[PDB]
């Protein structure tokens, strides 16, 4: 199905970047247009931390206090005045989209500044982390804060995870969380053939029906993943998104591989 047609149909804006890491083939569609990445950035903060902490050291503990807590922290809110391992922080951020877990992960890396530094080293000059959760969700089409483009984001994911510096164990670990997340079943996972394995992290900003999914898709009989970034938004601040957009975009895109 044409991507223009899905835009028309859903009255939405679609940004896609897909890369078959076996061949290098790319599918692009508004791949240089900026979009709020929302929670799909949990995948990137989680990988950046895993580049600096070996799997056997994930049992290291960090103290959580009252000041750490931000809205929507299903797991971390039970940890006030307690310590958690780095392993459980990543589990909480990835499976439950715990916002306190993500912020603490950022602090462990060293703060946004350091996250930004790492993106520049990978050659990503586009992804622009500015705020922590939850303010990073207050997207404004007139501001570059906390946005990236489908292209810049997907290249970064490729470089961090599909072909980066993680150990095999840290890679399995992060990918298992993405494979088992149920929050992304109506998204890319809903659109690909049943043959395909899907490791994703979804996201949703507060404004402009900003609705996203990023994934490592493994087609039947292929061990190298296809990296797939799908960002979408609408013209109005109070618009509600339709997950089917993403299911339908994934389905179309998969047709080229």
From Swiss-Prot:
<dbReference type="InterPro" id="IPR012640">
    <property type="entry name" value="Membr_lipoprot_lipid_attach_CS"/>
</dbReference>
<dbReference type="InterPro" id="IPR000871">
    <property type="entry name" value="Beta-lactam_class-A"/>
</dbReference>
<keyword id="KW-0814">Transposable element</keyword>
<comment type="similarity">
    <text>Belongs to the class-A beta-lactamase family.</text>
</comment>
<keyword id="KW-0378">Hydrolase</keyword>
<keyword id="KW-0614">Plasmid</keyword>
<feature type="active site" description="Acyl-ester intermediate">
    <location>
        <position position="39"/>
    </location>
</feature>
<dbReference type="GO" id="GO:0008800">
    <property type="term" value="F:beta-lactamase activity"/>
</dbReference>
<dbReference type="GO" id="GO:0046677">
    <property type="term" value="P:response to antibiotic"/>
</dbReference>
<dbReference type="InterPro" id="IPR045155">
    <property type="entry name" value="Beta-lactam_cat"/>
</dbReference>
<dbReference type="Pfam" id="PF13354">
    <property type="entry name" value="Beta-lactamase2"/>
</dbReference>
<keyword id="KW-0046">Antibiotic resistance</keyword>
<keyword id="KW-0732">Signal</keyword>
<protein>
    <recommendedName>
        <fullName>Beta-lactamase</fullName>
        <ecNumber>3.5.2.6</ecNumber>
    </recommendedName>
</protein>
<dbReference type="Pfam" id="PF08139">
    <property type="entry name" value="LPAM_1"/>
</dbReference>
<dbReference type="InterPro" id="IPR023650">
    <property type="entry name" value="Beta-lactam_class-A_AS"/>
</dbReference>
<feature type="binding site">
    <location>
        <begin position="201"/>
        <end position="203"/>
    </location>
    <ligand>
        <name>substrate</name>
    </ligand>
</feature>
<dbReference type="InterPro" id="IPR012338">
    <property type="entry name" value="Beta-lactam/transpept-like"/>
</dbReference>
<dbReference type="GO" id="GO:0030655">
    <property type="term" value="P:beta-lactam antibiotic catabolic process"/>
</dbReference>
